[model samples]
Target: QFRVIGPGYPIRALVGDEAELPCRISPGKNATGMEVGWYRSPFSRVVHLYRNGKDQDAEQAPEYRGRTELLKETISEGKVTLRIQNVRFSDEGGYTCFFRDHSYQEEAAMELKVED
Candidate 1:
């Protein structure tokens, strides 16, 4: 089984700044081979994506293209924390972190509030 944690409350950030949206796989499973993706809710857009041990940018949303990154150092330990740089007002909204390892998949949600 796979599950995500830490993206539970409203994460705050300032315009033109960066913010970290935390999402960790419980039990600290090896996620090196898993598909990790962060999406803005409604689950229609990708904010950041990781697959085959690298970032896949082709399907990422244009506004988030150069602004999203996964904390690669923690992936082996099931951490999929996503960082957003140069945050804009439009970035404020509900976000979802989805993790999938073969047949098992799970997701978690968090809210982001961008400030002036």
Candidate 2:
């Protein structure tokens, strides 16, 4: 069993409202130097990577540009908080949180609701 320590946020947003989705990650033993990324299923692709508490914007997909930011100071403390400045109806979906320690991974998934 994988253990991730922290609260799981349940986000309820209105279309055009700004929202933040959070995923707290707790590393396993010998899990130092891990790289964390956020993705979505059906696609299962990465949206951002947080390594050493720094944002690596150059590698992100264009679809997510100007809309994704990792709260690094918070991420280091186990808060994988992603802030979306404006919520759209299209943004209503599911996201998967991934923590990669070399090849090892810890994952969590959640669904988001965006209403008018």
Candidate 3:
């Protein structure tokens, strides 16, 4: 079987609105023991993660508080989407999505813009 890796969506909504970046693991198999993570690439830190049906937000990097959330509703399906509410101009930057499927892995990015 063939496998594909990397991000799916690059460009997203502007500040003040919500943004969704879709990340998938191809040949969806052996993902039962995987850890999905969302991070802010500008600072190179983790935002949140999904493991054992619970999102450990308290373990999130100190740099990102009151501005990020890891939607862990449907992670098992390889849907690791990060959501940022009340987006600010400062939120406009690069992001990294790391998915550790048991042992295999992949990453992707998403960009945001603010209009005055």
**Predicted model with the maximum TM-score:** 1
Give every collision pair in model 1.
none
Best by lDDT: 1
The model with the greater lDDT, 2 or 3, is 2
TM-scores for the candidates = 0.93, 0.75, 0.71
Q: For residues 1-116, what per-residue lDDT tens digits would candidate 2 score against the true structure?
A: 24444235556888887777776655434322557677766666567766764667877766677778766555445555777767778677777777765656677777678989
State each model's C-alpha RMSD to the native.
1.2, 3.3, 3.2
* Candidate 2: residue 36 Cα off by (Å): 1.4
Whole-model lDDT for model 2 versus the true structure?
0.66
lDDT of candidate 2 at residue 102, scale 0 to 100: 63
For model 3, the stretches where C-alpha displacement exceeds 4 angstroms are 1-9, 29-33, 72-74
lDDT tens digits by residue: candidate 3, 6-110: 454355567677665556566555443567677776777776776655666776776556656665445555555567766667666777777775556677666
Candidate 3 residue pairs that clash: none
- Ranking the candidates on TM-score from highest down gives 1, 2, 3
